[PDB]
Structure 1
Amino acid sequence: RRRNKMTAYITELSDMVPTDKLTILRMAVSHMKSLLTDQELKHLILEAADGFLFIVSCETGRVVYVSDSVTPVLNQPQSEWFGSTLYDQVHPDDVDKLREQLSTSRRSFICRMRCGPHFVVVHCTGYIKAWKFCLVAIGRLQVTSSPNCTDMSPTEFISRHNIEGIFTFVDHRCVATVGYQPQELLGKNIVEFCHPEDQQLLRDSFQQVVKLKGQVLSVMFRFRSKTREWLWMRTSSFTFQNPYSDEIEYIICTNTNV
C-alpha cells in the first residue's frame, strides 16, 4: 500500500500539471523551474492575518518603509505613511508606550493607529535590526475581538445583582430608561424601586433564578423612575455561575421598558 500512495502521489501531480512514469517526474520540474516568493507570502499575511510590513527608524520614529498592504489594512494611502513618523500614525495617548518600545531583539505591543478621526487597535510584532537602529514589524488588525460598547452612544439596560437583589452593577443606559444616575441605583435593592403590589412577584422570581440556574425567567413589574412615575418593565434574569467552580457569581438582568 506504500506503492499505492506513491501511485496516487504521481497521479494527482499529473492532475495539477496540465502540460511516461519515468518521463513525468523529469517533465514536472520543467514546469516549475519556469516559476516561496516574498510577495506571495505578503498576500498570505494580508489574507490570514490582515497585516502589513513597516520599518521605522527607532529614534526619529520616521518610517523608512511601508508595505503597500497598509492601504487595505488602514484605508491609508502609502504616500501618507512613508515620509512621516509613527507618532503621527498613533493615538496621542500611545506615544508613551511607543517611545518605550522604540528605545535601545524582539518587540511586541498593541496600539491604536489612524485610518482614512477613527482609530483601530493594531497588534505590532517585529524586531529591531541595525541600520543607527531600525524596527521592522508587522501591524495586524483584528487579531482579537472588540469590546461591546452598546451602553455608550434605548429602552433597556443590563444590571448585575447579588443573591439579595442589590444593584451591584448597572450600565450607563439606565439614566435614559429610568432616569436615575447610576449612583442612585447601585447599593439599593431592586425591590425598593418596585410598586408595592408587585414586590412579592419580583421577589418570587429572584428566588427561582437562584434555584433554576441556567434558565432565564422573566417578570413584569412597575418601576419607580426618578420622576416617581410607575414604569411597567419586564426583567429577564438568569443566574451567572462560575465556569470553573459553579460558584454563583451574581444574577444578570436585562431591564426592558414595556
Structure 2
Amino acid sequence: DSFCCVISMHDGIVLYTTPSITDVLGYPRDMWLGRSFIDFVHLKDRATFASQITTGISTFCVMLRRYRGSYEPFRLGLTFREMLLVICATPIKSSYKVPDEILSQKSPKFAIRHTATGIISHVDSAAVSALGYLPQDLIGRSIMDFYHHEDLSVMKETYETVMKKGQTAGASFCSKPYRFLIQNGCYVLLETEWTSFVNPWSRKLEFVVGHHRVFQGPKQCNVFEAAPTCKLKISEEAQSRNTRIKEDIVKRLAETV
C-alpha cells in the first residue's frame, strides 16, 4: 500500500496527495496540500532528499512522520514528468518474521563497502529491510563502530586476512558468522564473504567489499522499532583496551600488501 505527492523547482509545497494517504500514512489528502514535502521528511534524511531531486532531471529511502496533532520508514521512488515530480512513497517493512530466526538461503544479499580508514562508502538498499539502517544513517560512519566488542579481538584476524588474501588479483575468502548490531540494538550474525581493491601500483587498500548475507535475525524482531540500552561493562579497563585493537586495525591499512 503506497500513496503519492508531487512538486519541484518553483517552491516545493505539495500539489497532489493520493487519497490513499489518509490511510497508509495517517492524514488526509488536502491535509498535505499545505506546505513543502521536504519539511515532512525527518530532519535526518532531509539532506539526501534535496540531493536526489537535484540528481534526477531512481529510488532512495527517507523517514517520513505520521501525524497526530513517531516517524516511520519509506522508500521514495520518484518520476520526473513534464516541471513537477511524482513521488510514490511506498512504506518499508522489516525482513525478519519470527525472533532469533535462522534465515534460509534465499535471504537477501546486501553488501556494504568501506575505505581503509574504516568508513562505509556505499551501502546496498537490500540492507535497509534487514538492518533497519537507511543508508544515510550509515554511509559516512565507522564500520568498526558496529562490531560487538567481545568480538573485534577475533574480528581483527578476519580483517587482516583480507590483505593477505587481498594480496592476490581479487581473492575472496568467506568469513565466519560474526555479530553486528542493527537499528533496534539487537545483534545479527552476517555470513559475510570478503574482497578488496588494492590500488595496483601505489599498492594500497582502496576499499573493502563485504557481500553480507545475514545468518540469524534479532532477539526482538521488527528491525526499525525503538532502541534500548542494557549493555555496559568495564567502560574503563576495556572500553579503551578495545579502542586499542580497533585503532590498530585502522593503522592496519598500511601498504605491506
Calculate the TM-score normalised by the size of structure 1: 0.39
Which structure has more RCO (C-alpha within 8 Å, separation ≥ 6)? 2
Indicate the structure (1 or 2) with the bigger Cα radius of gyration: 1
Bigger helix share:
1
Bigger strand share:
1
